[PDB]
Symmetry: C3
Subunit: 186 residues, 3 copies
């Protein structure tokens, strides 16, 4: 039989109040707190914390302060990653981010979700679906990414967009819901 | 004659810089600060603070850190309430929330508003309209609730939604503006 | 030849990792940190910090806590300015705000942007376009303002709006994208 952590990672229904998960979420908030309390000139310190927090980190990385995570280890990031002010990463499942990806302020990537049915939801069962972002992607400010979304290479997501469906590579996409408005040279 | 606090609660025009209201807003920020400075394993402490902050609290409650309120006492919450990261409650008027309601990160419930006319607005007069959320409601990430909105039981509001009109029970509602897209079994 | 700071202010392409700009961004975060760590009854202190932070400040000003800026000096604000909880000012270029303007919580004003082309973007080059807000303007909660936007006098921007095009004076504007829905008496 699977553990609650295993059900979680596999996109199945799990109980978040599982002791192991609660204490993993505690460990995450400790590093998060340490990260957000650092001083503006403590780049070395922040970088170390990110390497303990995230599942995988490239050579260079810059995440502006007040970062929000659930577990940290489900966050996998490529080279030269940039995340601006107040980004939220609900990494119940894998948030896999490619190379040269930069996040504007207030970008929210949610992998978690709840049952539509109230009785199921009120029971405490919960789900996750991994999010994928390709190489060379600029994500605008206040963009929301929903569970199970894949974003291709060479994509520019306009500010305030709500990504509900997959966005193909080599496109510009804006809106609520988020749709392609332009193609671009590869 | 009514006091400014009374005008506020009754949905009438009031001056926010009223001495009583300013010092009530100060008291609110003190508890808010205490709440947001707690350590990740201080559940007992956070729970106590919420019972001093909110108008009414159920048996169990979990609000993730960095909460934003104006007064606190206008916030009335039911059983098993959950509020994720960085929720904002502008409780100029009553924010009444039912049982088994869970808020995703960055949910913003605003009850306050200003006069459309500039001269009225520049005079400092201000208004409020209470917000109502029924039992068994899942509110998505980055959802904004406008003043005077009532949300029925069994409602799922999709992420990034902007609730401008009332949402009937037993529905799924998304978008900007927020509209019903599905009905659901009761 | 122009410096990187000069290219920035002039709307041209610049490298943000320029030593002068990095240390100006450090100075900004120091004041920001001091501002956000103040206690709820330290109005005098916050006001002083804002006068060191912002390019220009009127007689009276109230900015609620957790403010986010990049440089500060590009932010020019008029009389009786109000900014509520968690506003973000990406002032790569000039953010010029008129008199009697009030910002609701979570208002995000972005002047910065990146090249559409990935190779240009991955090179580290970056741009800015100034944002202008007229006198007597109420900006709703969670409103996003994109680079190069001018907002006229007597304008009410509804909550959750995403301003992508210029908004004429004497109008009410909502939506994603943000459009005029009403005219109003001057
Ligand atoms: C340092 C850092 O981390 S970056 C900091 C900045 N943060 C940000 O969020 C900035 C993001 N920049 C944007 O969102 C811009 O709007 C861009 C890049 C998407 C603009 O791309 P463009 O395709 O050139 O927009 P353009 O002005 O040419 O017109 C696009 C059309 O779609 C609309 N549109 C553009 N952006 C958006 C948007 N974000 N949301 C909704 N609609 C939009 C326009 O209104 C226009 O409509 P229309 O022509 O049918 O009338
Ligand atoms: C631990 C916690 O606190 S929870 C943390 C997570 N935070 C979140 O915000 C997650 C919320 N989940 C969502 O918003 C999901 O999108 C859900 C639950 C609304 C999806 O519901 P569904 O009805 O099953 O969406 P579905 O994929 O079937 O299709 C719905 C249609 O409306 C659209 N749609 C779905 N969600 C949204 C949305 N949030 N905004 C705009 N449009 C949407 C879809 O594009 C689709 O359009 P179409 O069929 O006309 O082409
Ligand atoms: C203390 C402080 O700092 S303020 C704190 C509060 N923060 C806020 O964000 C509150 C802002 N208030 C709002 O956004 C309000 O919705 C207002 C002021 C824009 C309402 O203005 P009104 O024109 O009177 O809205 P009204 O109810 O009359 O109807 C407007 C129409 O546009 C729609 N609409 C109204 N507001 C919005 C919105 N924010 N987004 C999208 N659509 C909207 C309505 O659905 C309605 O549609 P319809 O008539 O075609 O069916």
């Amino acid at each position: 039989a699977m553990t609650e952590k295993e059900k979680m990672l596999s996109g199945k229904g799990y109980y978040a109040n599982d002791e192991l998960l609660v204490k993993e979420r505690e460990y995450c908030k400790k590093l998060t707190r340490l990260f957000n309390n650092t001083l503006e000139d403590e780049y070395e310190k922040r970088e170390d914390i990110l390497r303990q927090l995230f599942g995988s980190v490239g050579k260079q990385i810059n995440v502006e302060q007040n970062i929000r995570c659930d577990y940290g280890y489900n966050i996998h990031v490529g080279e030269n990653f940039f995340a601006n002010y107040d980004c939220i990463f609900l990494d119940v499942c894998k948030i896999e981010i490619g190379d040269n990806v930069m996040l504007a302020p207030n970008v929210q990537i949610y992998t978690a979700y709840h049952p539509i049915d109230a009785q199921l939801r009120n029971s405490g069962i919960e789900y996750g679906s991994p999010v994928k972002i390709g190489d060379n992607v600029w994500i605008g400010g206040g963009v929301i990414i929903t569970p199970g979304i894949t974003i291709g290479d060479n994509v520019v997501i306009g500010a305030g967009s709500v990504v509900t469906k997959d966005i193909p590579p080599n496109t510009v996409a804006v809106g609520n819901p988020c749709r392609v408005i332009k193609k671009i040279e590869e």
